[PDB]
């Protein structure tokens with residue numbers, strides 16, 4: 001069980017850790033988060049009480065280094081940093097733990113939610129989507145645009161998701177125009193899976209990461225990416241059985257976790273109705289269809 | 301964006317453009333079978349691809365063999381249209397290729413965009429205009445070449461005959477669409493108007509009769525009256 005110590009909390013802020021969150025008041029004696037489960041990526045995120053504009057946060061994996069958060073009063077945000085002195089780090093973390101100035105990662109033992117949302121998400125792939133090679137953790141915020149968005153403006157601050165475009169030469173073989181547009185199996189299986197992602201696990205990892213950035217930061221380009229990766233599978237007549245069964249589980253837990261009050265802005269009516277009721281896979285997502293129909297029957 | 305009443309004059313500027321109408325590509329007769337069920341029999345069709353500035357009509361005849369063994373023919377027809385238009389564009393010299401293609405039905409947008417991915421700078425546009433190009437098969441010489449075809453075939457026409465020697469392309473398109481709207485609303489009466497004078501004939505190299513300027517004014521008035529009359533007969537006005 002690992003720890004993200006904090007220097008202090010000089011400004012009032014709502015802090016998130018994965019799917020949990022809590023309020024810290026201005027200058028409250030708050031020194032961090034302990035008992036963070038080893039084996040998963042995590043995200044620690046922020047929304048200032050005085051300006052809910054800009055949610056921001058950091059993806060990290062405590063197996064890759066000792067990370068702490070200190071507020072920067074010049075740049076006006078809580079920054080993640082790495083401590084390379086392991087001895088000073090341990091000794092400082094212990095002092096805080098003894099004075100009980102840390103919140104405990106509040107995982108219930110029955111609860112596999114975070115595992116289910118991050119099953120295929122790997123820090124090494126996050127760091128290729130979010131390019132900042134001198135840090136082992138990755139910054140994301142509400143306003144970051146995607147490479148695809150930038151085509152239709154700072155590249156160093158972009159989300160380098162894999163570009164999916166259904167009306168593109170990449171998606172359509174010459175002489176198979178109708179076939180490839182109406183059944184996207186070629187584009188899914190040969191172009192994307194075999195060609196770019198190499199396997200379904202990397203594809204699902206980017207899908208899951210895009211959803212999480214949409215949910216935690218309200219990042220619009222991430223929501224577009226999530227829906228495009230769902231629609232590419234649902235619009236393919238030929239998909240491996242294990243991929244459909246895994247996709248049903250992935251989406252079930254995403255829909256389960258979404259805030260009920262945020263569904264009007266995070267769910268695309270056209271894509272979901274197409275996927276659940278018109279597409280080739282309309283009868284393959286039993287768990288997702290059941291939770292969608294009971295939780296969001298208005299959208300459908 | 302879409303073509304409507306407000307940007308109408310764009311049709312007659314000097315940027316090459318084509319209208320594509322697919323309404324006569326997939327054509328059937330519906331009949332009863334011996335068992336009393338219903339079946340369809342396809343008949344030859346055509347793609348109507350028109351340059352509104354010059355009158356050049358690229359009439360691609362769709363022979364019924366293209367449907368043999370195919371499913372979902374009304375969907376296929378849109379993609380077959382897009383395939384043939386794309387082939388036409390590729391067959392034209394670069395300086396003759398259109399800068400815009402306007403489809404008369406929105407269901408052609410995706411099929412044509414996908415077939416034209418190699419031409420990113422050719423704009424594929426819908427229109428809000430209700431154009432009467434479905435009535436192209438009421439022009440006798442066009443219907444005749446379509447029905448006689450025994451194989452796929454492209455036939456080139458000027459749908460304005462020699463009108464542009466005397467009138468502008470705006471006026472020629474207005475004449476054409478008035479004629480076609482009349483043939484669509486009451487084909488029998490419209491053809492009676494066009495042909496009731498034996499002394500005015502159709503040149504072998506033309507589609508329409510050789511009316512003088514004064515006679516075209518009378519003809520055009522007669523077509524308006526026909527359209528208004530049918531409008532009242534229909535709605536009881």
Ligand SMILES: N#CCC(=O)N1CCSCC1
Pocket residue numbers: 005006007008068069092
């Ligand atoms: N000095 C020093 C480091 C520091 O200010 N930290 C306070 C809490 S976070 C880890 C130690």
